[PDB]
């Protein structure tokens, strides 16, 4: 029985959107800029930044987008994406993230958003069980596909 | 003569995703292969002894949503029809992971052995309550919240 030491950087990895709510429905409608499907998040304690990787549809086409946010002394984060944004983490753990985002667009219109995201956790012993099983059946390592990374880097 | 297995897998139902899939025959999991399956959801029914699989596959340029129902056997294994006959065995399971071994026999009698690792997307009640309270605090109407876990308008992994 052992567990990895908790470090903010240990929260980095694949994350997925569960729910997103908005005071302005147009922002999260089909082709809305905030109807974002999360791919991965990278937390950096030393630089005080969070990098967001997500996908969103625009002009009927899916786009891969990266946004870097910077921590403020008040602990909140600022990011530029379809206007200015102030992002606040309401609850966080090894498995979930609940946040509140304030957006002011290029016309001075304000929208407040709430979101629930969850982390996809892959443990070491489970990976080991899969690999031992795979060699037991005589399957070559080049004969296995990583589905998780394909979803994290769609097109 | 082993004894009976007390099986309560009902609470493992929910959204699950594919992590890895290995195969003795590479053509089955390559692009356009019938076994390059992106899992979406698993529903276990302890009373009927079944498992329903919901997943997506791309067959010749188009994306397909597939539903497969499997049935347990005295054996402890499950059988299902999908691109042939299949015998599925759960080798390791827990609230978050499933490691399985599947044997497929296609229409030409060819036997393929596959291994797989799948992980569960677990959404806790404590966190769901926190989100709904916050949502209410900001005056957002429930009609204005989008569910991203069960939504047909999603991105393609390939």
For chain B, what percentages of helix, strand and coil (3-state, to nearest 5) are there?
15, 45, 40
Method by which this entry was solved:
X-ray
What is the 8-class DSSP label of residue A141? G
Between A55, A91, A146, which is nearest B20 by CB?
A: A146
Residue A97 · residue A117 · CB < 8 Å = yes
Domain A1-155, second-level architecture: Beta Barrel (2.40)
What are the CA-CA distances from residue A34 to residues A81, A89, A96, B139 (Å)?
Answer: 10, 17, 19, 18
Which value in Å is the resolution of this experimental model?
Answer: 2.0
- Report d(CA B57, CA B156) in Å as an integer: 10
What is the 8-class DSSP label of residue A82? S
Interface test with A, best of B31, B36, B127, B137 (most A CBs within 10 A): B127
Interface contact A134-B115, CB threshold 8 A: yes
Determine the 3-state secondary structure of B154 from DSSP: coil
Contacts 24+ apart (CB under 8 A), B127-135: B127/A91, B127/A93, B127/A95, B127/A96, B127/A98, B127/A116, B128/A116, B130/A90, B130/A91, B130/A98, B131/A19, B131/A98, B131/A114, B131/A115, B131/A116, B134/A90, B134/A98, B134/A100, B134/A114, B135/A21, B135/A114
Closest CA to A37 of A24, A59, A55: A55
Between B138, B144, B148, which is nearest A25 by CB?
A: B144
Interface contact B99-A126, CB threshold 8 A: yes
Extents of the domains making up chain A? 1-155
Q: Which residue of B has its CA nearest to A99?
A: B131
Neighbours of B34 (CB within 10 A): 17
Determine the 3-state secondary structure of A28 from DSSP: helix
Residue B55 · residue B38 · CB < 8 Å = yes
Residues 6 or more apart in contact with residue A6 via CB below 8 angstroms: A94
B101 touches chain A (CB under 8 A): yes
Interface test with A, best of B95, B145, B149 (most A CBs within 10 A): B145
B1-158, CATH topology level: Lipocalin (2.40.128)
């Amino acid at each position: 029985e052992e567990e990895a030491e908790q470090n903010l950087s240990e929260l980095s990895g694949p994350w997925r959107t569960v729910y997103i709510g908005s005071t302005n429905p147009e922002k999260i409608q089909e082709n809305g800029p905030f109807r974002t499907y999360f791919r991965e998040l990278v937390f950096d304690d030393e630089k005080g930044t969070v990098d967001f990787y997500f996908s969103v549809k625009r002009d009927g086409k899916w786009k891969n987008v990266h946004v870097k946010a910077t921590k403020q002394d008040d602990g909140t984060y600022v990011a530029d994406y379809e206007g200015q944004n102030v992002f606040k983490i309401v609850s966080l753990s090894r498995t979930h993230l609940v946040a509140h985002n304030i957006n002011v667009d290029k016309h001075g219109q304000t929208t407040e958003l709430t979101g629930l995201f969850v982390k996809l956790n892959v443990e070491d012993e489970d990976l080991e069980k899969f690999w031992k099983l795979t060699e037991d059946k005589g399957i070559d390592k080049k004969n296995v596909v990583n589905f998780l990374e394909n979803e994290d880097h769609p097109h």
